[PDB]
Design a binder for this molecule. Sequence first.
Ligand SMILES: CCc1ccc(-c2ccc3c(c2)-c2c(cnn2CC)S(=O)(=O)N3C)cc1
Length: 259
Amino acid sequence: STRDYEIQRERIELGRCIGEGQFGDVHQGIYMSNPALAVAIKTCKNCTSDSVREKFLQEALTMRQFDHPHIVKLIGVITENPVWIIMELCTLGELRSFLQVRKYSLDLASLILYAYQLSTALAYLESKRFVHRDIAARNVLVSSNDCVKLGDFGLKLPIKWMAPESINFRRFTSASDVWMFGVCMWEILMHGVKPFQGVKNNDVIGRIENGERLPMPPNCPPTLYSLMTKCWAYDPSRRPRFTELKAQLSTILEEEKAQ
Ligand SMILES: CCc1ccc(-c2ccc3c(c2)-c2c(cnn2CC)S(=O)(=O)N3C)cc1
């Protein structure tokens, strides 16, 4: 039930389209509540069929259960047609593009901060025993210069980001997540460059079994690259826990900020 966070439509002013989620466009809006607050609104294209509506609204019921500095907050829902999900707005958009445009204006400490930040959230999700089953929707958003957040919308499987066991047996565990986090970390230090550029998806799995890994990013600290490669151990029982990563990242950030 949603009655404790049902929003009245007139309190929401739907603005410009800003991205796409799995179910429809995402809009910017102003929500008159405290203030008259900037929000992100998930919309739903074909919520005119019942089954799509159930799954769209499930995204909200799920988000509702978490409260963390680095996971996108649910503000509310409107459950009459047309159905909307009202989320906090991450002003500065997608991390990938953010890192690219800011390649020459973000220091190493910030890039590490982001990785650390995400690991605190992933550790929380692990402690809440959440299984995120929609891997294609996984994305990172920037709410400010010093704050990134997990989300399932933007501002077909990710073969290139996936653990080999996910690829061969469709096994998805806390460990496969760690593998993907490893890639996401690499991505961050590479200023939002995607993994395996030019390489075909099907030739990916072969290269991994051959011992090949994504190389050390320019200016990436050997301590942090070591963390990454541990995220990419083949035997998924060799990979570190997120709680292991949160801590290991915490002292790496301290080493840099001290310089
Ligand atoms: C609030 C629901 C929710 C939506 C998306 C995620 C999300 C977003 C991005 C992710 C991830 C999750 C993610 C990663 C590794 N494991 N997981 C699942 C917890 S990741 O590689 O850091 N990555 C890109 C988590 C919760």
